[PDB]
A paper describes a structure:
To investigate the molecular basis of ATP-bound LolCDE, we determined the structure of the mutant complex LolCDE171QE. The structure of E. coli LolCDE171QE reconstituted in nanodiscs was determined to 3.2 Å using cryo-EM. Despite the absence of added nucleotides, additional cryo-EM densities were observed in the catalytic pockets of LolD, which were identified as ATP molecules and magnesium ions. In the ATP-bound structure, TM1 and TM2 of both LolC and LolE are more parallel, creating a closed interface as opposed to the V-shaped cavity observed in the lipoprotein-bound structure. In this structure, TM2 of LolE undergoes an inward and upward movement, resulting in an approximately 90-degree bend at the periplasmic neck, transitioning from a relatively straight conformation in the lipoprotein-bound structure to a bent conformation in the ATP-bound state. In the ATP-bound structure, the hook of LolC lifts and shifts towards the interface between the PDs, positioning itself to be accessible by both LolA and the bound lipoprotein.
Depending on their roles, mature lipoproteins are either retained in the periplasmic leaflet of the IM or transported to the OM by the localization of lipoprotein (Lol) pathway, which consists of five proteins LolA-E25. LolCDE forms an ATP-binding cassette (ABC) transporter in the IM, which sorts and transports lipoproteins destined for the OM by consuming energy from ATP hydrolysis. In this study, we determined the cryogenic electron microscopic (cryo-EM) structures of endogenously captured lipoprotein- or ATP-bound LolCDE reconstituted in nanodiscs.
Author numbering:
A (entry chain E): 4 to 414
B (entry chain F), C (entry chain D): 3 to 228
D (entry chain C): 2 to 212, 217 to 398
Write the structure that this text describes.
Amino acid sequence: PLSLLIGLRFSRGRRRGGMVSLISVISTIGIALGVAVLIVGLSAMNGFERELNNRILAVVPHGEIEAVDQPWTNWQEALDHVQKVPGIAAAAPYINFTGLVESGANLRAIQVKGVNPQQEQRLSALPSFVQGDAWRNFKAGEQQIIIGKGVADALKVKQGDWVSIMIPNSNPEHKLMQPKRVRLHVAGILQLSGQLDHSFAMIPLADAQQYLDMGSSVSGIALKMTDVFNANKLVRDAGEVTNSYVYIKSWIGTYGYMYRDIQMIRAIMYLAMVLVIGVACFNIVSTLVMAVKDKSGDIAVLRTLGAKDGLIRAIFVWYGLLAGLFGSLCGVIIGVVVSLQLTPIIEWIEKLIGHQFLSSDIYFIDFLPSELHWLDVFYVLVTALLLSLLASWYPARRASNIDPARVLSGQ
Amino acid sequence: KILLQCDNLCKRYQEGSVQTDVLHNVSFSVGEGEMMAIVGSSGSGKSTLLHLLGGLDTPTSGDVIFNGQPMSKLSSAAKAELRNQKLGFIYQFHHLLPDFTALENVAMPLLIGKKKPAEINSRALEMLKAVGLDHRANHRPSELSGGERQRVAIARALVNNPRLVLADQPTGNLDARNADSIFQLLGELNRLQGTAFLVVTHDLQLAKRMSRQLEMRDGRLTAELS
Amino acid sequence: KILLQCDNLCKRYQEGSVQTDVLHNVSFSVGEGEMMAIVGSSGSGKSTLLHLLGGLDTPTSGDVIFNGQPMSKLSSAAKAELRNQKLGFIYQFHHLLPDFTALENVAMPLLIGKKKPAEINSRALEMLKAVGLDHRANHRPSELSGGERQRVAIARALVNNPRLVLADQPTGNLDARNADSIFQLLGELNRLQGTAFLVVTHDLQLAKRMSRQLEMRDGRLTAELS
Amino acid sequence: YQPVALFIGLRYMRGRAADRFGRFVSWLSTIGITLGVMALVTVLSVMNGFERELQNNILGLMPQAILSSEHGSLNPQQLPETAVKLDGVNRVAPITTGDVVLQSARSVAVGVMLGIDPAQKDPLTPYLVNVKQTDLEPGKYNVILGEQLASQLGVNRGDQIRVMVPSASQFTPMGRIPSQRLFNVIGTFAANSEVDGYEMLVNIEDASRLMGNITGWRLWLDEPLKVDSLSQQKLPEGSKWQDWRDRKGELFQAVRMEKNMMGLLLSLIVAVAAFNIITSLGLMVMEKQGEVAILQTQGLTPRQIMMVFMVQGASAGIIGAILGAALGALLASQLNNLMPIIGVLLDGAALPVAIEPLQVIVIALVAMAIALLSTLYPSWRAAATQPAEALRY
Ligand SMILES: Nc1ncnc2c1ncn2[C@@H]1O[C@H](COP(=O)(O)OP(=O)(O)OP(=O)(O)O)[C@@H](O)[C@H]1O
Ligand SMILES: Nc1ncnc2c1ncn2[C@@H]1O[C@H](COP(=O)(O)OP(=O)(O)OP(=O)(O)O)[C@@H](O)[C@H]1O
Ligand SMILES: [Mg+2]
Ligand SMILES: [Mg+2]
């Protein structure tokens, strides 16, 4: 076709040009750089977004429903009354209190949570794959139970060592009395992390009924959903059927400052990504505009000979495709490689320079996590091709609409 | 018939709210097959008039009618067809596409016209040989000379056999022999196919070989003074 | 005495495997204050010879001696000065800076030469009037006609009062009257300032006004023929 | 005028134009420099604002660092307050910190003890409500709590709180009784921070510990994120050195990860912006290769051509940098009032500072230097070609 011939000749126009001209190589490595930085930024954003879900949202439970400090056994319908609102992945009744652990004169305050025998791992991913410990086999007997590794700072214990337990009375009356201090056998240690696994232990719901005095009443409830940052709505919605007293606080209510910080972090990252998108798209459109502005004279000469506007449109969409397809392909080739297998440690000292620019300033590692999506790559290619077509089209028709004699004279 | 007629058109320029008038009520007409010469002093306005007749500029007054159809009111496709099939133009500074060869430059009007590739090369080579430029068909315009570039532009203008050729100093950068050969070729083309040659020339003795010898001064087409 | 001498000047062009040579041991000398014409056929090699003598190109097979100084063994800090004061050049297509006015274009070599101001305007206006361009001293080269765009280059070459002027077709875009006036101006300049002129021309009439004529048939500077 | 280089450089800018779009192509380089500078300064302002806001709102009430000394109820008699010589230290005050279980009339919770002298001023002082920091007599065992904590366990003015210290436990062959005390709350206390959930304050002189109590030393940090370099410290046997990273460790990890990601995005922005400046000015120089040929024909030294192109590059870069700095400062200061990011997240806000001397000044200078250096090589390449060779095109 004639238009492809003219576009290719325009691409290789400068002198012989070898294969391609200076305008072509400059206009085709800007697109590659833009595509590369776009997919790198999106991969880093996905890698960070995966970290927040795994390390923060999965660690803490969402929502609660508290009792009326009376024997309340009619809670077996709660697991049937959590599916009324869609999105509730799982639920599990739970009990909470506080106590002391004694091992070699190393008493430490530990809050203890009682979990369901079968729904301790479906409700949340916290006590699921910590170390593959001796869990899920507690039974009502065998009161030896698991604690985090980080609690053993001054305590030197292992999977079978014995410790003491202090409990309060918690009688169903107006006020509290002296603690009962009923001891128990506990053995078993897990490891999850260093922040929550500091003074936190775990007890069954089955062994919490005896040597207590609320009549086998499970005070609290637990929930897990998908709209974590919207979870305030579904926690209240699922608590429509409940006892006389119901509290509708959730992870947002209990951890409002942490949720606010997380939202601020996400907003800042999205703003930075929008900035990267804006900057990395300007060097694509701007470079392709100058090429057509240079070729305006040949556009005028072609219009003099009787070239219809459709021919010029075809010529310059072919020009944009040639400058865009190769650049975008090279961009994804370099970017996928540099994002999947990032340059691990070669960052120490750059090339020798006559004057060192701001030496010994703030230095930060670029990115530890990076997730491959293989769908944002397609969107990046689509937007790069669309921008390449649009950049080399408007100046083409603008120059084609001018009278040939005026522009050819240099006006 | 008559082929091109000017209806009292005049051109002025606004170089930043400054008026420098260049044309004054040009109302001449040309038949078919009539070889015409326009002669004038430098800066008089010959090239502006020639641009106006070809539809390459806005007259800002009056209109130019091509055998019944005014150029002011014409569709873009119709204007492109007219400029490609029945109107050849020779610029005063022979603007050629710099990335193509001389043969490709001459063959360019035929390629736009959607002709068979078998005859396109033959016609382009014949026209290149007509202006005596056979031995430079593979040279880019950057590798050509002033005379050769002018001859390439002349060959490009006549390669499509148009009904009217608007020439703007076609022999400016040529010697006496090549100018005589070019004018002879123009005469043979006029005699064979009947194509009118509206030529602006600075040469007086070579303009004596024309039917009518209009002189244009101060934006006005005088009948004949010098 | 001699002013500009060239001997065994050969220039050949080779971009691909195809070779194209343009000069064959061209040898000639020009003395001070001497008219000369290098009239010849189109494509002969007139323009490339003028480029070679002006130091704007590499001969690669010879040497050009200007005032006893070979052009090859010349630092860039000395070539510029020679090219600014001793020598003036007129391109065939009068390459002008398309962002200055004509007045600034004519006065540019005076600005480059570090002349003290407030008479640069006087000399530029004097030259613009001498070539006959007083009324177009504020137009950019885009707003100038082809004929008067050449006079700006002619004035720009002569505004610095050089010793040798290499003119490459200073006539092809002009009428007979303007050409006669400019040739009278060149003769007047030789009479007063004593500047040698090397003019390549295609008009055989005003070539006879030149003191010496050469031919350059096929790249060799023969004595005289037609 | 006499500086011909400056005259030609100024005339190269402010081109022929004569069109709405004609100016855009000539100002592309200035627009690109402005965009890059504005993006850099607004992202730096947002980053610094978040860092400062989090630092204040979190670590302006909790101890950023503290030493340990539990032997003999140590006083400054072993070492005065000038014992610490580490960098980044601005102020040191006595402190006493440890986990304590608080038993109320109806609930039991946990917290951390804070030892503040009544004469000494602590960072939590202005947030006291209805109280004037009094009643903290050494003789009286008065307890200060937090508003969130007090609402959590249900304790108000005129109540009693049992205090147990699990760390200070006397192991004996009868029971496992830890340190036990009874404290009276005689005030209302509050703070608008996360630390209000478990803050509680007492006098340093108390018998809460075994032995008559341990005496730490609160250590304010000029850079609260410097704590990764807390290796250089001295301490006696039986004790250690502690950091704020013991609590909020996941917060420290999240802050480090966010800083790393922001640094990567900044590097990407700089890489894209620096490429755009380098190529656009080089193409502007290469496009007018015929003009320099005419100038060399008239007798311009290649140094003068280099000066012409450097002047043009500087004129573009200075305007671009100034406009970018102004636009970035305006955008940072108006990221919420104008609401340009209409799709704001739920309960999410961006806090700027737009600090001038060290951020918006060095970026502009680096951009101008890049604009200068991008022009030098293309001008040198263009000045090397013969005048008759470049003018053939
Ligand atoms: N914007 C403009 N466009 C064209 N010509 C302009 C403009 N402004 C002023 N002029 C003047 O108007 C006149 C128009 O002349 P024109 O370009 O038609 O050339 P001409 O008379 O054919 O000359 P020649 O054949 O000697 O080059 C010239 O004197 C030119 O300087
Ligand atoms: N780079 C090149 N490669 C090949 N051939 C070239 C090159 N440059 C010039 N030539 C050829 O060498 C010859 C020298 O051309 P030159 O410009 O000297 O001719 P001229 O007599 O001035 O032309 P005109 O009559 O058009 O003014 C021409 O035949 C030209 O085609
Ligand atoms: Mg003209
Ligand atoms: Mg020539």
